[PDB]
Amino acid sequence: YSSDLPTDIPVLSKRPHTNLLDYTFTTFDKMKNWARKSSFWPMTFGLACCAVEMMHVSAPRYDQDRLGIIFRASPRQSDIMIVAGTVTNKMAPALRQVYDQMPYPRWVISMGSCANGGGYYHYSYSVVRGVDRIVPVDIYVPGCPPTSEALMYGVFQLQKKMMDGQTHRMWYRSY
Ligand X SMILES: CCCCCCCCCCCC(=O)OC[C@H](COP(=O)(O)OCC[N+](C)(C)C)OC(=O)CCCCCCCCCCC
Question: Where along the sequence are the contacts to another protein (CB under 8 A)?
Answer: 93-94, 139, 153, 156-157, 160-161, 164
Question: Which of the choices another protein, ligand X, ligand SF4, none does residue 93 contact, using the CB cut-off of 5 to 8 A by kind?
Answer: another protein
Residue closer to ligand X, measured from CB, 27 or 147: 27
Among 31, 94, 144, 163, binds ligand SF4 (CB under 6 A): 144
| Binding residues among 8-47 for ligand SF4 as defined by CB under 6 A | none
**DSSP string for 44-99:** --B-STHHHHHHHHHSTTT-GGGGT----SSSTT-SEEEEES--BTTTHHHHHHHH
Q: What is the CA radius of gyration of the chain?
A: 19
Q: Judge whether 85 and 115 are in contact, CB under 8 Å.
A: yes
Residue closer to another protein, measured from CB, 15 or 72: 15
What is the binding site for ligand X (CB under 6 A)?
Answer: 17, 23, 26-27, 30-31, 34, 163
Dihedral sign of CA atoms 28, 77, 70, 140 in order: negative
Residue 24 is given by DSSP the state: H
Q: Is 48 in the site for ligand SF4 (CB under 6 A)?
A: yes
* Nearest residue to 105 via CA among 11, 8, 36, 46: 36
CB of 89 to ligand SF4, least distance (A): 15
Question: Which of the choices ligand SF4, another protein, ligand X, none does residue 171 contact, using the CB cut-off of 5 to 8 A by kind?
Answer: none
